[PDB]
Structure 1
Amino acid sequence: GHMGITAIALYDYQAAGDDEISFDPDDIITNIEMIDDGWWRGVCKGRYGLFPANYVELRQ
C-alpha cells in the first residue's frame, strides 16, 4: 500500500477551481497533505488538488 494518509468524504464537494478536487460522500481521498488548517491537498478519482479539510474524516 502506497496511499499515504487517507480520509473518507463526509459531504459532496465540487471543485471551484482548476487547483481543487471534487468528491461525493464515501469517496476516498488518498495521499493527503495537511498543508493548511482549512484546506488540504490530496488525490481523489484521478485528480490532485485542494479541498476543505472539514469535509472529510481521516482514517484511523
Structure 2
Amino acid sequence: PVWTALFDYEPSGQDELALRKGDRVEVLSRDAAISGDEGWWAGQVGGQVGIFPSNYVSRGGGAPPIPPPR
C-alpha cells in the first residue's frame, strides 16, 4: 500500500512537509502524539520529512495496474 498526494500543499510552518500532486508520501506516523495535531500525519517525500494534512493524500498508487485489453 502507498499514499499519493492528490493536492499541492505549501508549508505555513517550518515543520510542515510540502506536497505536490502525485507525490508518493511515505507515511511515518498517523499518531497525533508525534505530529502534534489531530488530522496531521508525519511523512516523507523524497528526502524531506515533516507533517502534512492527512486529507491531502489518498491510499492508492504503488504498482501500476495491468491495463485492460485492446
Q: TM-score range by the shorter chain?
A: 0.7 to 0.9
Distance in 1, matches of 2:16 and 2:45, equals: 10
Indicate conservation of the 8 Å contact 1:6/1:32, yes or no: no
Q: Residue 24 of structure 2 aligns with which residue?
A: 28
Indicate conservation of the 8 Å contact 2:6/2:57, yes or no: yes
Q: Residue 45 of structure 2 aligns with which residue?
A: 44
Structure 1 residues not aligned, in runs of 5+: none
Q: TM-score, normalised by structure 1?
A: 0.78
Structure 2 residues not aligned, in runs of 5+: 33-37, 62-70
1:18 to partner: Cα distance: 1.4
Distance in 1, matches of 2:29 and 2:2, equals: 10
Aligned residues: 56
The structure number with the bigger radius of gyration is 2
Identity of aligned residues (%): 34
Moved over 2 A (4+): none
Q: TM-score, normalised by structure 2?
A: 0.68
Bigger strand fraction: 1
Write the letter of the residue equivalent to 1:35. Answer: D
Bigger helix fraction: 2
